[PDB]
Amino acid sequence: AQLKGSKTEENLKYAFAGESQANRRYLYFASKADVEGQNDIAALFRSTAEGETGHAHGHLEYLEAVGDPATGLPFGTSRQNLQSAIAGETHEYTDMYPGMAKTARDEGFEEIANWFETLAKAERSHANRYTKALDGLVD
């Protein structure tokens, strides 16, 4: 009866990840079609992407029962949502992207290493800006 700990919980998280990536992929594909002059194709990728947004947000709604897939924290309210966003961003900029940059440099992918470092700096900016917003929140 409890979603927490079930296979269904893991399935919702996986499906949420897949839906999220589908929207991003289809918008990338729309941009390619845009440049090529395939305007009907581009419009279809965009329309389909809107479906994937609906699917992802439906998955997230069920996952309110168990926590944010990125952090395990409760979500729903702006206060909660900001806290979760800050935790997630903090992980990305302190641990994830610097680690990925190091691995890339070690493997000989200097440009991709620099890309990962650019992104570490960007997530730090996002984390700081969300923390400012959380301090300014009136609820």
User: How many other β-carbons are positioned within 10 Å of the β-carbon of residue 101?
Assistant: 20
Give every CB contact of residue 55 below 8 A, 6+ residues apart in sequence: 15, 19
Q: Which is nearer to Mn ion, 66 or 70 (CB)?
A: 70
Q: Does 9 bind Mn ion (CB under 5 A)?
A: no
CA separation for the pair 5, 47 (Å, rounded): 35
Among residue numbers 18 through 47, which ones bind Mn ion (CB under 5 A)?
19
Among residue numbers 74 through 113, which ones bind its own copies (CB under 8 A)?
75-78, 81-82, 84-85, 88, 92, 96-97, 100, 103-104, 107-109, 112
- Contact residue for its own copies among 46, 60, 74, 128 (CB under 8 A): 60
Least distance in angstroms from the C-beta of 71 to Mn ion: 13
Phi, psi (rounded to 5 degrees) for 66: -125, -20
Give every CB contact of residue 117 below 8 A, 6+ residues apart in sequence: 97, 98, 101
- Contact residue for its own copies among 46, 66, 115, 131 (CB under 8 A): 115
Contacts with Mn ion by CB under 5 A lie at 19, 52, 55, 123, 126
